[PDB]
Amino acid sequence: PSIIVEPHVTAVWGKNVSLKCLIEVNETITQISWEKIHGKSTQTVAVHHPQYGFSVQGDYQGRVLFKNYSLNDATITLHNIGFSDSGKYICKAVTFPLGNAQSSTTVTVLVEPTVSLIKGPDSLIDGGNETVAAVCVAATGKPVAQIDWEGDLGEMESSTTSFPNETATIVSQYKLFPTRFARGRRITCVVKHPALEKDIRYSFILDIQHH
Amino acid sequence: PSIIVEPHVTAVWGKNVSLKCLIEVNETITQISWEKIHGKSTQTVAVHHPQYGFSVQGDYQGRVLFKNYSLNDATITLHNIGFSDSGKYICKAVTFPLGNAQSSTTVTVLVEPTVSLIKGPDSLIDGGNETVAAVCVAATGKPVAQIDWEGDLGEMESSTTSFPNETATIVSQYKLFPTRFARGRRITCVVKHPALEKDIRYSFILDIQ
Ligand SMILES: *[C@@H]1O[C@H](CO)[C@@H](O[C@@H]2O[C@H](CO)[C@@H](O[C@@H]3O[C@H](CO)[C@@H](O)[C@H](O)[C@@H]3O)[C@H](O)[C@H]2NC(C)=O)[C@H](O)[C@H]1NC(C)=O
Ligand SMILES: *[C@@H]1O[C@H](CO)[C@@H](O[C@@H]2O[C@H](CO)[C@@H](O[C@@H]3O[C@H](CO)[C@@H](O)[C@H](O)[C@@H]3O)[C@H](O)[C@H]2NC(C)=O)[C@H](O)[C@H]1NC(C)=O
């Protein structure tokens, strides 16, 4: 309506997110609140009342700040984000005399992957058969990270395991036939994920041996 | 929930009703209100706020009174009851901090019939053909009334004519074969209707010759 909110929002596990709400009703504001859908019932996250002040409820206590004291600005920030913070929220303005108005914001919780780049277990002998030259892991991210490789020296093979909390670990091995042409060149693991401000990039120089 | 109301209320057109609502939810009450369901949205009927006062909305203005100033008593009275007052209402208490709680009341609007008894067009002469001794009309009642007769001097015939506002008129003629035996007798019309506390009764003494 005149309840201005962002319709869809992502939140990174263990960081902060802002639940924006501007109230332009041109009406007398009785109180304003954020609520969370639970079945058909809703549960209160935070309340502002012009005489009774703020209130934060449930497991949100200690993790919710009201941006400012204006009754027309219902924006809050949520902190120490966890999986249960996902779902549909309602910003609500109760007004006098016409009553309530609202708009919804759905929150998706993302988890940053833990990335590591490791060398293959076997040494890369020139003229030898296909060997795993490196292994890139992006562990327990939500959703699963994406892994790409730079340096066209071979081919990629990956597996993914998803977990009850809906994070996923992806393991990607880079396979190549060692040659003279590949010696001294650099292979890069590139991990893309929506919780990342920029792609994680790890690389190292190929060591190709003698005989 | 914690909202005490009556599930269903009968209301008579042109009269009064109370919509009862007692609120003791345990916590600070920021405002209380009665609302009317319109589609899936609701229209406000009346609102009581501790600092802002009473407020009445729509076509309820001049027809709604709050029973008292107590925030725990949302009871109102509705006056000059009209067809549109029919429908489903919700009493609603908004509280601080947990928010609103509500309960519904459904209102049916009845219309009292206008009842009259007349002595029939032709005059009452003996040994002859059936003659209409009296006509009883319960007009534009909602729903249609029932008409019964007391005094066992003949049979009745009745017709019903419905109207767009959902009131109906029923006209009942009482026919009899006139007899010297029937003079001094009283015929009685009895009209039954849910808007009536008792049956309406109109009677008169048959005059034969
Ligand atoms: C979502 O579920 C996954 C699957 O259980 C969670 O991953 C697990 O997290 C624990 C705690 O960090 C990991 O254990 C730790 O790592 C090594 C184990 O060898 C050890 O050095 C540490 O002291 C500790 O034991 C566990 O390995 C890991 N399981 C995996 C990656 O398969 C994940 O943390 C959950 N995420 C959230 C946000 O709840
Ligand atoms: C529900 O429906 C019927 C039909 O619209 C309404 O009945 C009509 O009521 C009016 C006024 O009560 C009657 O007409 C009036 O007659 C007087 C003479 O007594 C005259 O002064 C007025 O100008 C007007 O013409 C009319 O006889 C009556 N019609 C029938 C067929 O009975 C009824 O009032 C409606 N009721 C509600 C609660 O809305």
- Looking up residue A97, the CATH number of its domain turns out to be 2.60.40.10
Residues sharing a CB contact under 8 Å with residue B198, sequence separation 6 or more, in sequence order: none
Q: Is there a single domain that holds both residue A104 and residue A130?
A: no
CB of A200 closer than 8 Å to CB of A188: no
CB of B132 closer than 8 Å to CB of B178: no
Question: What spacing in Å lies between the alpha carbon of B36 and ligand 2's midpoint?
Answer: 29
The tokens for A172 are 């990607």
Residues sharing a CB contact under 8 Å with residue B114, sequence separation 6 or more, in sequence order: B137, B138, B139, B140, B141
Which of chain A's residues have a Cβ under 8 Å away from the Cβ of B30?
30-31, 49, 52, 94
Q: Is there a single domain that holds both residue B82 and residue B44?
A: yes
Q: Which residue, B81, B113, B145, sits at the end of a domain? A: B113
The β-bridge partners of A125 are: A209
Q: Which residue, A97, A113, A129, sits at the end of a domain? A: A113
Q: Is there a single domain that holds both residue B19 and residue B70?
A: yes
Ligand 2 within 6 A of CB of B140 = yes
Residues sharing a CB contact under 8 Å with residue A71, sequence separation 6 or more, in sequence order: A23, A29, A32, A48, A50
The best mutation among B163, B166, B169, B171 to test binding of ligand 2, ranked by most ligand atoms within 8 Å of the C-beta, falls on B163
The residue with tokens 């003229």 is A127
The residue with tokens 């027809």 is B63
Please state, in angstroms and rounded to a whole number, the distance separating the CA atoms of residues B195 and B199.
Answer: 10
CB of B120 closer than 8 Å to CB of B129: no
Q: Is there a single domain that holds both residue B40 and residue B92?
A: yes
**Which of B33, B55, B97 faces A47 most closely, judged by CB atoms?**
B97
Q: Which residue, B70, B95, B113, sits at the end of a domain? A: B113
Q: Is there a single domain that holds both residue B119 and residue B109?
A: no
Which of chain A's residues have a Cβ under 8 Å away from the Cβ of B96?
31, 47, 49, 52, 55
Please state, in angstroms and rounded to a whole number, the distance separating the CA atoms of residues A156 and A124.
Answer: 16
Structural domain count of chain B: 2
Q: Do A96 and B28 touch (CB under 8 A)?
A: no
> What residues line ligand 1, using a CB cutoff of 6 Å?
A 13, 111, 139-140, 163, 165, 167, 169
Q: Is there a single domain that holds both residue A66 and residue A169?
A: no
CB of B153 closer than 8 Å to CB of B161: no
Which of chain A's residues have a Cβ under 8 Å away from the Cβ of B94?
30-31, 94, 100
CB of B15 closer than 8 Å to CB of B81: yes
Please state, in angstroms and rounded to a whole number, the distance separating the CA atoms of residues A31 and A48.
Answer: 6
Which of chain A's residues have a Cβ under 8 Å away from the Cβ of B44?
97-99
Query: If DSSP codes are grouped into helix, strand and coil, which group holds residue B205?
Result: strand
Resolution of the experimentally solved model in angstroms: 2.6
Q: Is there a single domain that holds both residue A127 and residue A51?
A: no
Please state, in angstroms and rounded to a whole number, the distance separating the CA atoms of residues B73 and B54.
Answer: 13
Q: Is there a single domain that holds both residue A195 and residue A181?
A: yes
Please state, in angstroms and rounded to a whole number, the distance separating the CA atoms of residues B110 and B160.
Answer: 17
CB of A46 closer than 8 Å to CB of A34: yes
Residues in chain B whose beta carbon is closer than 8 A to a beta carbon of chain A?
A: 28, 30-31, 33, 35, 42, 44, 47, 49, 51-52, 55, 57, 92, 94, 96-100
Q: How many CB atoms lie within 10 A of CB A2?
A: 12
Burial of B60 (0-12, 13-18, 19+ CB in 10 A): buried
Q: Do B97 and A35 touch (CB under 8 A)?
A: no
Q: Is there a single domain that holds both residue A72 and residue A59?
A: yes
Residues sharing a CB contact under 8 Å with residue A53, sequence separation 6 or more, in sequence order: none
Q: Is there a single domain that holds both residue A109 and residue A14?
A: yes
Range of the domain at B192: 114-209
b/e code B68-98 from CB counts within 10 Å (16+ = b): eeebebbbbebeebeeebeeebbbbbbbbbb
Please state, in angstroms and rounded to a whole number, the distance separating the CA atoms of residues A97 and A30.
Answer: 9
Q: Which ligand is nearest to the CA of B167?
A: 2
Nearest to B120 by CA among B89, B153, B92, B95: B153
Q: Is there a single domain that holds both residue A2 and residue A104?
A: yes
Nearest to A209 by CA among A117, A127, A120, A152: A127
CB of B190 closer than 8 Å to CB of B200: yes
Question: What spacing in Å lies between the alpha carbon of B98 and ligand 2's midpoint?
Answer: 51
Please state, in angstroms and rounded to a whole number, the distance separating the CA atoms of residues A193 and A145.
Answer: 5
Q: Is there a single domain that holds both residue A123 and residue A179?
A: yes
Q: How far is CA B161 from CA A12, A22, A70, in A?
A: 70, 57, 62
